[PDB]
Structures are given as structure tokens and as C-alpha cells.
């Protein structure tokens, strides 16, 4: 009952959705839209199976783009340090085989065996990639099947299985020109092609300006980091309950 | 024979254990600790072995003990139990003795005098007590070893307890029962025995090359990768591989030096003297002296690191290689690297699995080897793009995350970076914006704390100033003090920014903000440099004077006053009518304030503070007799 009441106080309160957004990476100032977006990504939708046999994705993919001053890697660090299952990786460091699946020769026999890549690890969780625009196109392609079908298909050297890849991809990247070329439009500043853009259910571009009223507050509290609603443990307890409802 | 006498040595230590003091410093050392040891629920003592060289007879024991360390320690174990029993029940100070009496203890000297180094040892020096130092790299998993063997008679189920002596297994020939006496009936049960932990830890040893250490019992997994280590153990080579049976491991100046430090700390020309003394070969460059010096002082580390990094955007003929080559020597030992001759693997690492250890092993690259220190990256403009991508996470989290085939892990490479970069082309071109003279992307160019534009001008007057400095230097503070100062400052001072210093940062940053490339990256420099200045000052808080001077240093390093706010170009020259009017208006007001006060004159110090909230203007008035 005490566990029930503690978990209940985070559900049956009239402002909980407002409260929980302000409880995502409290060190990062501003960017109130991404705090809603990630929180929704952390509660991915209902998986459905058609009476015809087709299955429907329930997880949510999110991409974030900002200038090199806008703190975006902090969000990925928070997610990988908070999520039940999570994996952190970088754009240039990662590779196709390391992300999806590794074909490795197995012991106790002469036949191959899969090794869990980055996506297979933290399955039914959130996968995080930093500096997404730095990734090669040829190894960005390998994420495509996992982003929508939530499966990995392998046909390489005597292996033909299909593997569960129910993962919510979270990514961060920077515009093609380093800074946001504010002369142009959103259509021209991103090198991400149409297919990958369509898959991301949410897509944020956050910009910075020389507004004094904002910078004074921004400088005020980032200094407090170097000077020094619901707790971070409460959110996992709430999510372990919320993930059950199927509206 | 044995240099150790069973009764002589225990008597000699007994005198030491009850009479030792260092020279309130007069209090005896172990007269206090003996009660504390009886309080402890521990099973061993890390003996303060530096006391052995602090007392006369103990050093004589050390030389005698140099070839027989095991026997005394075994005697001390019983002595410790006897000392416990005597202090508990014989002194009647305690009564909990049952577990202590039955169990076994050990003793570990930790600060014995070091030997003549590893490679200088000799075949007779094998099995002798030694003291070494090094860096731990890799650890093997827990390997159990036999201590007790469990035998059951396969025809009558009788059980024997057999213990190994000197690494020998003795198989019973017949069952010990009176009736059952079948030969060879005794059988061994693998999982009814008793085992002890054995671990092999790899150390990169620097003699007073890498040596594979060995640990046992509670000493296993106490040493992990990257630990800074001093070794107190036994050099071993047995029929022949060189290894050390570690007995204890350590996980890690005069008052006259303190007087020497304070003299430089007190003198007013501190900053002037440091610039004058840091680089005799390099002339002037006051800010560049302040720049690299503040890199070596570093900011405070909180959990937010103080790894100040600097870019030298100077012309490609100013002595900057003459600096960073010299920096690599004067600084506490780091690594000298060139961006042209380095790669992502060369800087970070090569990581692979091991069949024996069954966990990831690392081959440290250039960047990781500088963990906690300072590294120099020449030819930064020529670094490969893949390698440059590494620095983004390095200069934001000091970590590197790798996710490739079969390997998914993150490392730590906390270090300071000193970067020098020639301008695009054969020389700097001020006719172009500064951000276009530098071949670095804005994301990478913004995260540097300090960028210095060192330009050489063809002036006959300034040529003689530099020329006569060098030409007489090659005719015919020391580095020891300088390193002693820096190590002292890093050791003690952890300044905290005051309330007054905090508020001034807001106006300083906003002023650069409204003139826009003033990202929040440069706000990191507005605290990192502030702490490093107080640390040089040895003041345990960051002063507002440190704040404003550091802001000026950033301004002077980037040359904002000589930079066009419109297109970012630089003035070549950096009597005017604006100078005239300011002097005219200043002179007009001085003539009033000097006489508006109810006196014919006043002190010029008070007059300056009255109007500045000047000497030339009043001198001209004196020339005109006003
Ligand atoms: N809203 C904010 N709250 C706290 N810190 C911030 C904020 N915005 C920027 N920062 C600071 O500025 C830096 C921005 O770096 P970041 O944009 O994460 O680099 P990268 O582009 O490599 O991810 C961060 O280290 C962060 O500490
Ligand atoms: N201000 C200076 N002080 C001392 N030596 C200088 C100075 N300017 C140039 N030099 C000399 O010019 C030569 C050029 O070396 P340096 O500028 O350090 O690297 P680079 O040759 O790549 O430009 C050096 O041998 C150095 O002794
Ligand atoms: Zn028997």
C-alpha cells in the first residue's frame, strides 16, 4: 500500500504532466520542448498486431539539432544515465556492425553466431547517438529497419534469423554550416535526406540569439553549476507503471 | 643462516613499538595506535614503514631484514595476536577475544626505503625486499588456488582434511579407518575444498619498464586500471620471469622551501617576475607568459574540470615551437604530440579483447597517456578530420565513447591541451576576418578557452629590442623552484568564487554578447581562468581582480580592441580629434572641480577618483600656469 500510494501520488494529481516535463535533466536550462519530447519518447506507444498479421510500431524516434553552443549532449548523457536500459555512442566512433549486429565466429563449433550490437543492447529501451550528422550515410542506412519495423534482418554467412530491435533512437546533430545559417530556411541547413527525416516522429531545431534578458539568466545559472518537483528516482517508478496502460 | 633471530628481532621491535616518536610532535606514535588497533575489527595493519628510517636500530633491522622479510612478518602475526590478547585480557581493557584468538593476522610495511631500481637489481637481489613505483594498466580475473584438499574414501565415505605445504599435494595411500584399509581408496572432491584469491595486476614500472605484479587474498581487485601505485613487495624470478609478489601497495620538501615560496608569493612583481623567469629565450610576450602559465596552474576540479586549452594563432615565424618544446620539459611529465603525425587511434587507444582475461584491454594512445596532466598538440591545423572529431567529446566531457564490432565502452582522457596553429597561407592576412584566417570550424574554434594572435611587424625600433636580447644571450627563478611552486599551488589551493566576483561576470559576458561569436563556451573561460589566477595568487578564494584581469586577458588574447566589430578585420596600427575633445572636455572640468571645492587646490589622487568615477592634462595646464 505504501508503494501503491507513493506511485499513486505521481499519477492521480491534476498537474502531473506539467510537473514531469520540468523533471528531465534539471541541470540543463531552458529547452522546454525537448523535455516534453524525450519524456514522451520514454513512454512509447502501444504495439499492435493486425488481424491480418501485420504489426504496428509503438516506440518513438526523436532527433535534435542545434548550434554548437546549445547544450544537447547533456540530454544524451542524462538519458543514458537515467533510462532503465540505454546505450551511449558517438557518430564517428560507431559503425554499422557495431550498431545493429555482429557476425562473429562462435566457440565450440565451426559455425557463426550473432553478437549483440548497440541496438540489440538496451532493447525495449532508449538508444542514444551523438553528433548524428557526422555519421556516414552508408552506416546511417543500417538503423532504418530498426527505426520503424523494430526488427533486424540478417542474411550473412549461414545466418538468416530476424532479431527483435524494439529500440527508441535518440540523436543529436549540428547544422551543415556549424552555425545555423539564419539567412536561409530550415530546408537548406540540414543534410539529412527525406527518408530519415520522415521516420523521426519529433524533430527539433533550437536556436540562440543575443537577447540580453535571456543571456543574463542563462549566464546566472550556468555559473551556479561551477559554484554549487519529483525526484530522479521517482520517475523510473512512475514509468514502470505507466508503460502498462494501452489506451 | 638467517640474519633474523627469533627472540632478538621481536625484542628489538618491542622497544620500537613502545618508544618511537618522530623527532604536538612529541607524542609517541604507536602508544596511541595500539588502543586503536584493538578497537578495529580489521585483520591486518599497514605498518608506517617510514618510521624505520626515522629510527636508528630499525634501519639496522632493515638491512638485516633485506633478505628475510617473510620470517619477521610471520612472527609479527603471532606478535599481533599476542599483542591483542595481552592488551585485551592481560591489561583487562577488553573481553572480546574469541574471534581474534582463533583467526590469523598480517602486517604490511608501506613506506620502506626504495632500492636501486628494477633493472639495477642482481640475481642475488632476487627474493629480497624491494620498493618500487609505477602505473597499473590491466587486471586479471579472480583465480582461485588450492589451500585445503578434501578427500573422501570411495568405498566407506570417510573424509580427511589435507592441507598443502609449500605447494605440494600429498595423496593418501589407504583409508585411515581401522576396518576399511583399501589402498588408493581416497578420492578428491573438487568443490568441497577451500581456495584463495590469486590475481595478476599489470604495472608500468618506472625505476627509482612494465612489470607483471601479483597479489593475493584481500589485495586482489584493490588495484584497478589506471591507479597510481607505489609498490612494497618482493622482487621474484623463479625456475625466471620478472614479477613482484606485492606485500603492500600504495594508492597515490622543507619549511625553508615554504619560506622561499612565500617570498615570491609576497613580492609585488610576482606576475612580472614569473614572465621574466619562465622563458629566458623568449622575449617579452607578457600575455603569452600569463596564458600558458595559467594553463599549467589550471582551474579547480569539481563534480566541471579546469583543463584550460590555448590556441596560438601566431604568424609562422614567432617562437612558439621554441615554447611548447620547452613546455613539455618544464611541466610535470606530459606527452609531446603533433597533429600531423597523430591519428584517432594514435591519440585515443586501440581496444581489443583478450582470450586469457576475458575482458577488454586497452593500448593507451597519446591523449589518454596524458590523463591528469598536460599535452602539447603542434600542427593542430593539420589534424585529420576523424581525429578532430574526437576532441569534441574530449573538450566537453573528457571522455571517449567507442561502439564498434564486439566492443562497446567509454574511456576517460582528462587532460590539458596546448595547441599552436599557423594561419591559412604563408602569413596572417588581416584584410580577411579573423575567423577566416583560422582553418578550424566554429564548433571546434569556439570551445577553446584562449586564442592568441601573435603578430610580427617589421619595425626597425622593435627589431633592435629583440635582436640585442638574443645576440648577447649566447655568449660565454630556476626550474627546480618553478616546478616546486606549481606543485605547491596545485596541491593546496582550491579557491571559491566570491559573491562580488560572480556579479561582474554577467556584465562582462553580456558586453561581448551584444557585440556579435560569443557563445557560452567563452563563459567557461570566464570561471576557469578566474580560478587559475587565484591559485597562482595562492588566495583560497577567487578575487574580483582575478576576474577582471582574466577577462582582460581574453580580450587581449583575441585583440577585440583592435578588431573591426563589423567585418572582424584587424587594425594594422593596433593624435586624433576624439583625443582632442576628450582632453579638452577633461581639462574644462578639471579647471572647475579644482576651484569648485572650497580650496585653491587639492591632492591629485582625490581629484582623479572624483572625475574618473589626467596627469598629461594637468601638466599642460601647469605649462600654461593655470
Ligand atoms: N541551458 C544550459 N544549461 C546548462 N548548461 C548549458 C546550457 N547551454 C549550454 N550549456 C553549457 O555549454 C556547453 C555546450 O556544449 P555542447 O553544445 O553540449 O557541445 P556539443 O555540441 O559537442 O554537444 C555544455 O558543456 C554546457 O555545460
Ligand atoms: N621572439 C623570439 N624569440 C626567440 N626566438 C625566436 C623568436 N622569433 C623567432 N625566433 C627564432 O625563429 C626560429 C623559428 O622557430 P619557431 O618560430 O619556434 O617555429 P617555426 O620555425 O615553425 O616558425 C626559431 O629557431 C627561433 O629561435
Ligand atoms: Zn575407507
From Swiss-Prot, chain A:
It comes from Saccharomyces cerevisiae (strain ATCC 204508 / S288c) (Baker's yeast). Component of the MCM2-7 complex. The complex forms a toroidal hexameric ring with the proposed subunit order MCM2-MCM6-MCM4-MCM7-MCM3-MCM5; loaded onto DNA, forms a head-head double hexamer. Interacts with MCM10. Residues 16-223 form the MCM domain. The lineage of its organism: Eukaryota, Fungi, Dikarya, Ascomycota, Saccharomycotina. This is DNA replication licensing factor MCM6. Present with 13400 molecules/cell in log phase SD medium. Early fractionation of eukaryotic MCM proteins yielded a variety of dimeric, trimeric and tetrameric complexes with unclear biological significance. Specifically a MCM467 subcomplex is shown to have in vitro helicase activity which is inhibited by the MCM2 subunit. The MCM2-7 hexamer is the proposed physiological active complex. It is found in: Nucleus. Disulfide bonds: none annotated. Belongs to the MCM family. A motif (Arginine finger) lies at residues 198-201. Acts as a component of the MCM2-7 complex (MCM complex) which is the putative replicative helicase essential for 'once per cell cycle' DNA replication initiation and elongation in eukaryotic cells. The active ATPase sites in the MCM2-7 ring are formed through the interaction surfaces of two neighboring subunits such that a critical structure of a conserved arginine finger motif is provided in trans relative to the ATP-binding site of the Walker A box of the adjacent subunit. The six ATPase active sites, however, are likely to contribute differentially to the complex helicase activity. ATP binds at residues 66-73.
Swiss-Prot record, chain B:
One of its GO terms (cellular component) is nuclear pre-replicative complex. GO terms for molecular function: ATP binding; ATP hydrolysis activity; DNA helicase activity; DNA replication origin binding; helicase activity; single-stranded DNA binding. GO terms for biological process: DNA replication; DNA replication initiation; DNA strand elongation involved in DNA replication; double-strand break repair via break-induced replication; mitotic DNA replication initiation; nuclear DNA replication; pre-replicative complex assembly involved in nuclear cell cycle DNA replication; premeiotic DNA replication. Transmembrane segments: none annotated. Its EC number is 3.6.4.12. It comes from the Eukaryota. It is an enzyme of class 3 (hydrolase). It is found in: Nucleus. Residues 270-471 form the MCM domain. Acts as a component of the MCM2-7 complex (MCM complex) which is the putative replicative helicase essential for 'once per cell cycle' DNA replication initiation and elongation in eukaryotic cells. The active ATPase sites in the MCM2-7 ring are formed through the interaction surfaces of two neighboring subunits such that a critical structure of a conserved arginine finger motif is provided in trans relative to the ATP-binding site of the Walker A box of the adjacent subunit. The six ATPase active sites, however, are likely to contribute differentially to the complex helicase activity. Component of the MCM2-7 complex. The complex forms a toroidal hexameric ring with the proposed subunit order MCM2-MCM6-MCM4-MCM7-MCM3-MCM5; loaded onto DNA, forms a head-head double hexamer. Belongs to the MCM family. This is DNA replication licensing factor MCM4. It comes from Saccharomyces cerevisiae (strain ATCC 204508 / S288c). The gene is MCM4.
Amino acid at each position: 500500500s505504501d508503494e501503491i500510494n507513493e506511485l499513486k501520488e505521481m499519477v492521480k494529481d491534476e498537474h502531473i504532466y506539467d510537473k514531469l516535463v520540468r523533471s528531465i535533466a534539471p541541470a540543463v536550462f531552458g529547452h522546454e520542448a525537448v523535455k516534453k519530447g524525450i519524456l514522451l519518447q520514454m513512454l512509447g506507444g502501444v504495439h499492435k498486431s493486425t488481424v491480418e498479421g501485420i504489426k504496428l510500431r509503438g516506440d518513438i524516434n526523436i532527433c535534435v539539432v542545434g548550434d554548437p553552443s546549445t547544450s544537447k549532449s547533456q540530454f544524451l548523457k542524462y538519458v543514458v544515465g537515467f533510462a532503465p536500459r540505454s546505450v551511449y555512442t558517438s557518430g564517428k566512433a560507431s559503425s554499422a556492425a557495431g550498431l545493429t549486429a555482429a557476425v562473429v565466429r562462435d566457440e565450440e563449433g565451426g559455425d557463426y553466431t550473432i553478437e549483440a550490437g548497440a541496438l540489440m543492447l538496451a532493447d525495449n529501451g532508449i538508444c542514444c547517438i551523438d553528433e548524428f550528422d557526422k555519421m556516414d550515410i552508408s552506416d546511417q542506412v543500417a538503423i532504418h529497419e530498426a527505426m520503424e519495423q523494430q526488427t533486424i534482418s540478417i542474411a550473412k554467412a549461414g545466418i538468416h534469423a530476424t532479431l527483435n530491435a524494439r529500440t527508441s533512437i535518440l540523436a543529436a546533430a549540428n547544422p551543415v554550416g556549424g552555425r545555423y545559417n539564419r539567412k536561409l530556411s530550415l530546408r537548406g541547413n540540414l543534410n539529412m535526406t527525406a527518408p530519415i527525416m520522415s521516420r523521426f516522429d519529433l524533430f527539433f531545431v533550437i536556436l540562440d540569439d543575443c537577447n540580453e534578458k535571456i543571456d543574463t539568466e542563462l549566464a546566472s545559472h550556468i555559473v551556479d553549476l561551477h559554484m554549487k518537483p519529483f525526484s530522479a528516482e521517482q520517475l523510473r517508478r512512475y514509468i514502470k507503471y505507466a508503460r502498462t496502460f494501452k489506451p | 643462516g638467517t640474519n633474523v633471530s627469533i627472540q632478538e628481532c621481536t625484542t628489538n621491535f618491542r622497544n620500537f613499538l613502545m618508544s618511537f616518536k618522530y623527532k604536538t610532535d612529541e607524542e609517541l606514535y604507536y602508544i596511541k595506535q595500539l588502543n586503536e588497533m584493538r578497537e578495529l575489527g580489521t585483520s591486518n595493519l599497514n605498518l608506517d614503514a617510514r618510521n624505520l628510517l626515522a629510527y636508528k636500530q630499525t634501519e639496522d633491522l632493515y638491512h638485516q631484514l633485506l633478505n628475510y622479510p617473510q620470517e619477521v612478518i610471520s612472527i609479527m602475526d603471532q606478535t599481533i595476536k599476542d599483542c591483542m590478547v595481552s592488551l585485551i585480557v592481560d591489561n583487562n581493557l577488553d573481553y572480546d577475544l574469541d574471534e581474534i584468538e582463533t583467526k590469523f593476522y598480517k602486517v604490511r610495511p608501506y613506506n620502506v626505503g626504495s632500492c636501486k631500481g628494477m633493472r639495477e637489481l642482481n640475481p642475488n637481489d632476487i627474493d629480497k625486499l624491494i620498493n618500487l613505483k609505477g602505473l597499473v594498466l590491466r587486471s586479471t580475473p579472480v583465480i582461485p588456488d588450492m589451500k585445503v584438499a578434501f578427500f573422501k574414501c570411495n568405498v566407506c565415505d570417510h573424509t580427511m582434511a589435507v592441507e598443502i605445504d609449500r605447494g605440494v599435494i600429498q595423496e593418501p595411500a589407504r583409508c585411515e579407518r581401522i576396518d576399511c584399509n583399501e589402498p588408493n581408496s581416497m578420492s578428491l572432491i573438487h568443490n568441497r575444498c577451500s581456495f584463495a584469491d590469486k590475481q595478476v595486476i599489470k604495472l608500468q614500472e618506472t625505476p627509482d619498464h612494465s612489470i607483471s605484479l601479483c597479489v593475493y587474498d584481500e589485495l586482489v581487485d584493490s588495484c584497478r586500471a589506471g591507479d597510481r601505485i607505489e609498490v612494497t613487495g618482493t622482487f621474484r624470478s623463479i625456475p625466471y620471469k620478472t614479477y613482484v609478489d606485492v606485500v603492500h601497495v600504495k594508492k597515490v620538501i622543507t619549511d625553508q622551501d615554504l619560506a622561499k615560496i612565500r617570498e615570491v608569493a609576497a613580492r609585488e612583481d610576482l606576475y612580472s617576475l614569473l614572465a621574466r623567469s619562465i622563458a629566458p629565450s623568449i622575449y617579452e610576450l607578457e600575455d603569452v607568459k600569463k596564458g600558458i602559465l595559467l594553463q599549467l596552474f589550471g582551474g579547480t576540479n569539481k563534480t566541471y574540470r579546469g583543463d584550460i586549452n590555448i590556441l596560438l594563432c601566431g604568424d609562422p615565424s614567432t617562437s612558439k615551437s621554441q615554447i611548447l618544446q620547452y613546455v613539455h620539459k618544464i611541466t610535470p611529465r606530459g606527452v609531446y604530440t603533433s597533429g600531423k603525425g597523430s591519428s584517432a587511434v594514435g591519440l585515443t587507444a586501440y581496444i581489443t579483447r583478450d582470450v586469457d582475461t576475458k575482458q577488454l584491454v586497452l593500448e593507451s594512445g597519446a591523449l589518454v597517456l596524458s590523463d591528469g596532466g598536460v599535452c602539447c598538440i603542434d600542427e593542430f591545423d593539420k589534424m585529420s578530420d576523424s581525429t578532430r572529431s574526437v576532441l569534441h567529446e574530449v573538450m566537453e566531457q573528457q571522455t571517449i565513447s567507442i561502439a564498434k564490432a564486439g566492443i562497446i565502452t567509454t574511456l576517460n582522457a582528462r587532460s590539458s591541451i596546448l595547441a599552436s596553429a599557423n594561419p591559412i597561407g604563408s602569413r596572417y592576412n588581416p584584410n580577411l576576418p579573423v575567423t577566416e584566417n583560422i582553418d578550424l570550424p566554429p564548433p571546434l574554434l569556439s570551445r577553446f578557452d584562449l586564442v592568441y594572435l601573435v603578430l610580427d611587424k617589421v619595425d626597425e625600433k622593435n627589431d633592435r629590442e629583440l635582436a640585442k636580447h638574443l645576440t648577447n644571450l649566447y655568449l660565454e627563478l630556476p626550474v627546480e623552484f618553478l616546478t616546486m611552486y606549481i606543485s605547491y599551488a596545485k596541491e593546496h589551493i582550491h579557491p571559491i568564487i566570491t559573491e562580488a566576483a560572480k556579479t561582474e561576470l554577467v556584465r562582462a559576458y553580456v558586453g561581448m554578447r551584444k557585440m556579435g561569436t560569443a557563445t557560452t563556451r567563452q563563459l567557461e573561460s570566464m570561471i576557469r581562468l578566474a580560478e587559475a589566477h587565484a591559485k597562482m595568487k595562492l588566495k583560497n578564494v577567487v578575487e574580483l581582480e582575478d576576474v577582471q584581469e582574466a577577462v582582460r586577458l581574453i580580450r587581449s588574447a583575441i585583440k577585440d580592441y583592435a578588431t573591426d566589430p563589423k567585418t572582424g578585420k584587424i587594425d594594422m596600427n593596433l593624435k586624433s580629434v576624439i583625443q582632442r575633445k576628450l582632453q579638452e572636455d577633461l581639462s574644462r572640468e578639471i579647471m572647475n572641480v579644482l576651484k569648485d571645492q572650497a580650496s585653491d587646490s587639492m591632492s591629485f589622487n582625490e581629484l582623479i577618483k572624483q572625475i574618473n568615477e589626467i596627469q598629461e592634462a594637468l601638466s599642460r595646464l601647469q605649462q600654461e600656469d593655470k
